[PDB]
Amino acid sequence: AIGEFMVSLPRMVYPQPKVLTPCRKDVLVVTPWLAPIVWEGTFNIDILNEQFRLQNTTIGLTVFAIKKYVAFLKLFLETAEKHFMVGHRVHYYVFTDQPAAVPRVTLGTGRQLSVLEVRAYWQDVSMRRMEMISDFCERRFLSEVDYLVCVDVDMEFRDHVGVEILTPLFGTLHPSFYGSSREAFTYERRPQSQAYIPKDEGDFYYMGAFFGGSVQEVQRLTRACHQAMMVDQANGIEAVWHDESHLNKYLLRHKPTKVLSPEYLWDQQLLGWPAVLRKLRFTAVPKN
Amino acid sequence: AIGEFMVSLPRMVYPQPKVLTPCRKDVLVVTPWLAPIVWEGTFNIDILNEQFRLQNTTIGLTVFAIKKYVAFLKLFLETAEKHFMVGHRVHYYVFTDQPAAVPRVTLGTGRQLSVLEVRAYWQDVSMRRMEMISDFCERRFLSEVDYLVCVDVDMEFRDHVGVEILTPLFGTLHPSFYGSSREAFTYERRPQSQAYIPKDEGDFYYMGAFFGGSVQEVQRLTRACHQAMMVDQANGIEAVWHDESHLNKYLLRHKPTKVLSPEYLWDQQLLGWPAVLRKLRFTAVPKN
Ligand SMILES: O=c1ccn([C@@H]2O[C@H](COP(=O)(O)OP(=O)(O)C[C@H]3O[C@H](CO)[C@H](O)[C@H](O)[C@H]3O)[C@@H](O)[C@H]2O)c(=O)[nH]1
Ligand SMILES: O=c1ccn([C@@H]2O[C@H](COP(=O)(O)OP(=O)(O)C[C@H]3O[C@H](CO)[C@H](O)[C@H](O)[C@H]3O)[C@@H](O)[C@H]2O)c(=O)[nH]1
Ligand SMILES: [Mn+2]
Ligand SMILES: [Mn+2]
């Protein structure tokens, strides 16, 4: 449950936070709109686990595995079982055109998986994830989970991804652009697109492969992006990076209440393991 | 309004936040439970003003001026008009035993003041602020304001205090203890008190002179503190720092969603103007 009466935390013994000692001096840990940017060292997971378990939090995880991408499900789900929200209630929603190709993955207690069949297939395909999350699953998600997390399938968990990410609305810093100036961001730059962002605007470049929030906020985001993509289709334009371009426009105009660092979306083959990353949590798998 | 549909921000031109450049390297800007700690340099007030004005936010400010403390009202209110939530809707609630001693202070547009008469007077006096904020003003605050801010009167505003503070629940770092280790904090240490905190617990020492949040969360806090103070009275014990001791116990067990730095509660006569304070926003007036 979100927003409901919160019982007291129990007594806990942990290191005192010290006002004159930053957790991290090498990175920005809060946005200019006072949203935490989540890096290792910024959170005490024991405190957060307590807070979220006291609310009996349920997290939904959506993932699409259409056509050949069903091959990625086994590693995705098996590593999610090792690293994603362990100890919390989790409901996986696997959207696929091949229900029989979903691997039988053994789940920990308090965790469940639903296979949701969708159509095979390009413009309706580009809008598929945003449309599916909003238009068709609206009522189900509201009844079943407190938060939704929406990720790419061509990925594996290598380390902890937990309740530190949960908040009304979050996006994730794209691993290729976190050091870039805004003029270099690959936002949609054509004013004829609903995703248009001028060269003097932009906070961050968020990747389309990991976003989430409360069910209400995720449905707001996905509905807005779906509607904007439909306008573009009607006007004969497709944004340069498809749903990611629209996600970036949305998060510019509706600031996220947390931002995940690139620990949460990394490609080691492409980008190595820089000093600023203490953990590589959720990482690209080769898709050639 | 809180928690309601949020319209898009307009286009804004402002400096890009840079991931590899902290706003502040000299202080902790986020707690281990991912609450921002509000210091100058951590927020873009233009973004925040936009967000809160788009919600037509109304802020209530409670202040008690009983017996000789009515003398502090003129400077308190006149400086609040210069610095507190300017541009936003503000409702001052002045609780006093001398309604006729409230100074006639000229208010900016969209701002109003209500004089609420209370009894003169020691144990019911110690609980007065927490009881008054909870038990008697519950319905009125819910109908009239979105956030409540609860402050001492023996104070003046010298610089901006604005919507950067607003959040479901906040406390303020006590200016005398922000560099102290938790064992040195003047928490109530007797296990016979409801305010008891052992020497190995505690995040911060919050001052009783500036706390706030949403109306719901402030009523939860003030009700809990009032109830705990009544238990102590029944058991023949008064906590070492009265309502502040109880506030500290509450905020240990119910973590605040922002923490205000000592910019927001300072005594220059006692503590000077240290390098870590870029602004002195709300400061002690002599009360001899
Ligand atoms: O045949 C398919 C194709 C895709 N998918 C699904 O879509 C997800 C994104 O695609 P991909 O990972 O290739 O792109 P990335 O380059 O890692 C991710 C980026 O590029 C996309 C276009 O390829 C979009 O622009 C997206 O917005 C952006 O983030 C993929 O993980 C699957 O869950 C599927 O199930 N079957
Ligand atoms: O005759 C009075 C006495 C008080 N008040 C009201 O109470 C507020 C707190 O008291 P004070 O500022 O003296 O204490 P400080 O030392 O600045 C504040 C601290 O000490 C308190 C006891 O004196 C409590 O322990 C409190 O919890 C703690 O923060 C004061 O600002 C007035 O709004 C009033 O209206 N008439
Ligand atoms: Mn991908
Ligand atoms: Mn005072």
Side-chain angles (χ1 to χ4, degrees), chain A residues 27-61:
Chain A
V27 292
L28 187 65
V29 305
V30 68
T31 71
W33 58 90
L34 297 177
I37 309 179
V38 181
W39 301 90
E40 182 65 11
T42 65
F43 59 92
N44 184 141
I45 196 56
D46 303 318
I47 298 172
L48 293 173
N49 279 330
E50 282 278 355
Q51 292 181 311
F52 284 90
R53 278 303 303 148
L54 287 167
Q55 304 303 71
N56 196 206
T57 302
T58 305
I59 306 91
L61 185 62

Side-chain angles (χ1 to χ4, degrees), chain B residues 152 154-155 207 209 287:
Chain B
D152 276 24
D154 58 319
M155 303 292 292
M207 193 167 182
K287 60 173 162 67

Side-chain angles (χ1 to χ4, degrees), chain B residues 241-254:
Chain B
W241 292 103
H242 314 108
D243 69 9
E244 178 169 281
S245 298
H246 290 92
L247 173 69
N248 274 280
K249 181 64 171 283
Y250 188 87
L251 293 175
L252 175 63
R253 302 304 207 217
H254 303 85

Side-chain angles (χ1 to χ4, degrees), chain A residues 185-253:
Chain A
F185 292 163
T186 59
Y187 293 150
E188 177 54 60
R189 302 303 189 173
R190 294 168 290 175
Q192 297 78 21
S193 177
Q194 296 314 292
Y196 171 59
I197 300 167
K199 287 266 180 82
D200 57 356
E201 293 177 54
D203 305 305
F204 302 111
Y205 194 78
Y206 306 99
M207 193 167 182
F210 195 164
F211 65 91
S214 68
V215 174
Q216 179 170 228
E217 292 301 310
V218 173
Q219 288 169 170
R220 285 167 173 171
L221 178 153
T222 56
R223 183 167 37 256
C225 290
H226 178 222
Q227 287 189 199
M229 287 178 308
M230 288 189 297
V231 171
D232 273 12
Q233 185 190 42
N235 297 156
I237 188 166
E238 176 68 13
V240 62
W241 292 103
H242 314 108
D243 69 9
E244 178 169 281
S245 298
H246 290 92
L247 173 69
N248 274 280
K249 181 64 171 283
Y250 188 87
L251 293 175
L252 175 63
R253 302 304 207 217

Side-chain angles (χ1 to χ4, degrees), chain A residues 11 14 28 200-201 203, chain B residues 11 14 19 28 200-201 203:
Chain A
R11 151 181 171 89
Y14 53 76
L28 187 65
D200 57 356
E201 293 177 54
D203 305 305
Chain B
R11 151 181 171 89
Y14 53 76
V19 169
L28 187 65
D200 57 356
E201 293 177 54
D203 305 305

Side-chain angles (χ1 to χ4, degrees), chain B residues 15 22 34 37 41 56-57 63 71 74 97 114 122 125 133 137 141 159 176 181 245 269-270 272-273 277 285:
Chain B
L34 297 177
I37 309 179
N56 196 206
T57 302
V63 66
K74 185 178 182 301
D97 62 337
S114 298
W122 71 265
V125 171
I133 294 161
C137 300
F141 295 150
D159 208 332
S176 296
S181 292
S245 298
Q269 172 177 250
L270 188 74
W273 193 333
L277 305 183
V285 177

Side-chain angles (χ1 to χ4, degrees), chain B residues 4 54 70 95 107 130 159 195 207 216 281:
Chain B
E4 309 211 317
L54 287 167
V70 294
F95 296 94
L107 308 184
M130 297 299 187
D159 208 332
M207 193 167 182
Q216 179 170 228
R281 304 169 188 279

